[PDB]
Design a protein around this nucleic acid. Structure first.
Length: 160
DNA sequence: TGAAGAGAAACCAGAGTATACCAGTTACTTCTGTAACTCAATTTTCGGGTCCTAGTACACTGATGG
């Protein structure tokens, strides 16, 4: 069944997870969007033929699209935008209020827990997961260990 | 021919007299409870947040000294 907001922005209606995964794998069935492969002049011609086949255009038009839509750090930042200006001001104020300016232990902790296993390939390739496996991001609320854990409920999230 | 009282025109306090409040009580009403459905207004209460100031842990930094 379709997941839809039961509450405006807090909660969905009860829906079967298997049905939802099947809807998704049905709408992406054999479209090449669920690959789980790593990202890889002769290929240019095949790509242009594919674009001509999928967009009903000419090989010349496909090559033109491939050329024009091409992709289009350095800490210096000038000629700012709104949020870029806010970031510049924040950076300058931090440069004068802080003396060591390195990632706090909680920042590195949250990051190194989040990005602990990303792109980690299976050693066996027999425990490789199938294309389309519906990872659920549960988060289990810690019990009330400290008294203040009633106010702001700490949780640990698991990618089931 | 004064003497011991006789009369006479003043003050002066006080005892009824006059007020002056100041309670002292008889009917004669409302207002309870319970019941009920109704609806809106208002209160209470109640679990949980909410913000805020103040420490606190903890990994790292930055010398420091022997």
């Amino acid at each position: 069944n379709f997941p839809e907001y039961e509450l405006p922005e807090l909660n969905t209606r009860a829906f079967h997870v298997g049905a939802f995964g099947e809807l998704w794998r049905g709408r992406l069935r054999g479209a090449g969007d669920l690959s789980l492969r790593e990202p890889p002049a002769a290929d240019s011609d095949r790509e242009d033929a594919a674009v001509a086949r999928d967009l009903d255009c000419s090989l010349e038009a496909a090559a033109e699209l491939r050329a024009v839509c091409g992709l289009d750090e350095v800490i210096p930042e000038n000629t700012d935008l709104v949020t870029l200006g806010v970031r510049k001001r924040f950076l300058e104020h931090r440069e004068e209020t802080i003396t060591i300016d390195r990632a706090c232990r909680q920042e590195t902790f949250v990051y190194e827990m989040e990005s602990h296993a990303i792109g980690k390939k299976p050693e066996n390739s027999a425990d490789m997961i199938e294309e389309g496996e519906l990872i659920l991001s549960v988060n289990i609320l810690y019990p009330v260990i400290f008294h203040k854990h009633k106010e702001h409920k700490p949780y640990q999230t698991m990618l089931v």
